[model samples]
Target: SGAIYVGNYRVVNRHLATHNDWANLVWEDSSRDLLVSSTTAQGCDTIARCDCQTGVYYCSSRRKHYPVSFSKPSLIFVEASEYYPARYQSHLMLAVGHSEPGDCGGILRCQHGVVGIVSTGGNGLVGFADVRDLLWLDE
Candidate 1:
């Protein structure tokens, strides 16, 4: 839950892990629609994460003010709660969820407190055993 300088972007990871590779460093084509693939796109599909909660949103993974006007998030992070500890606790899981049919391209629908793109092309956290507490390729 601190600042990390990765290649230039001093990303503020919201979990116990630091120098976080949570973003996977694999930018997609958000230039179009985040959910669609176009030869003319250059960003990632993002969701709103928390900026310490309650009237504070952290502008998604790309660090925007918010999403591009998407629906209400199905997932949530309850602060100071036992269960949401992961959500508000750890990468909490980092960009590593499953694929959905409607979710075209190769977004992983990543979970945890951070709402960002998890590339299905790669887990983004393979070699670094130090952060084993981070997300792993699930079975």
Candidate 2:
């Protein structure tokens, strides 16, 4: 039998305290293709692809809004244990309550909803484990 070695890589874990923290996972494939996926406290199951070679990881849930893009691919572990209650305040003119203040509420809401579905405990979450395999694209 024979074994092969893959290039070195780094794992970045970004702690998501809110719903819309937009946590995700990304890495370069053997063919130099980019493999990206979004994660919650639930598990590392759902995966997606970024705009080829653009080095961008679009959330599988929100793939429709590409070209719009997100930040770089860093190691971020978004867990529901970090969930925080959202606040809504009525705007006098609009007569509607703003849900996501300071850009935290929306992300928090998403974290709670998504993670809640997949997680066993309240802190359902996911992580990215690096592996070197020729069959990276078999899926």
Candidate 3:
């Protein structure tokens, strides 16, 4: 089965709804295994499986606040934009306890590949040798 984005906000295009809503994707990684371009949710836009498949957990007090976890990720693509992270280190780091699976609090493990490699917006970057590694910019 294929997965989809599950959030209060609808990401018709690259535009985020900013509804302060709780965000998640369909078919938790370990649950189903398939993936797709989720809603506006980006897995903290770092090197992690949740960044691609399943999804990154974003919650809101006004929305349905809940605890969540994500799986480890890889820098499949790199761009200077993605989240335009304020602390732009150009690479992803493992969380204090999230370095290993089952350590991500109870968050579902990621089962990404094919539809798993996540993408993002224009970061206009430097070539990493053969790959200009950057997530997909808005269509």
Candidate 4:
């Protein structure tokens, strides 16, 4: 019911479970031509998934100021939200940074591919759900 984007790709649909705090956005690839042209192709087709647990990671959003920030999965587990079911607490991966209010559903790309989505955050930290887990994509 909300608008979300991965790069220039707009999210057309999503799957959000009552027990989960995160959602998997379904991008519209057909309408992608509207944003692209025969002159130069800017957007990408293949977005690989990676293990965000290791190495460096970063978050990206449409915010003009501090749109991108260096971050990594936190070693400590934190509750994502009190509104959602408490079961989601253990499923969240807390990231080290203060995410903007509109940053939810944004992409958290690791050294290689995107691994997580912005969920909720405050107090100089942001929480995300592993993209691989949300998609149920096999490693």
Candidate with top lDDT is: 4
Cα lDDT over the full model 1: 0.23
Q: Which one wins by lDDT: 1 or 2? A: 1
Measured against the true structure, the TM-scores of the candidates, in listed sequence, are 0.18, 0.18, 0.19, 0.45
lDDT of each residue in 1-139, candidate 2, tens digit only: 0011112211121222223322434332311112233343333222222212111112233322122112232333322333222222111011012211121111111111111010111122211122212234223
Better of 3 and 4 by TM-score: 4
What are the per-residue Cα lDDT tens digits for candidate 1 across 48-130? 33322111122223332322222222232323322123232212222222222222111122243333332111232200001
Residue range 1-139, candidate 4, lDDT tens digits = 2222344443221232222222332221211101111212234422345444542333444342232343443333334343333332333466557675656655555556655556666787766544433342221
Report the alpha-carbon TM-score of model 1 versus the true structure: 0.18
RMSD of 1: 16.3
Q: Which sequence of candidate numbers ranks them by lDDT, best first?
A: 4, 3, 1, 2
RMSD to the true structure for each prediction, in A, is 16.3, 16.9, 16.7, 9.9
Q: Model 3, 15: alpha-carbon shift in Å?
A: 8.8
For model 3, what is the C-alpha lDDT against the true structure? 0.23
Q: Which numbered prediction scores highest in TM-score against the true structure?
A: 4
Local lDDT at 28 for model 4 = 17
Deviation from native of the Cα of residue 77 in model 1, angstroms: 4.3
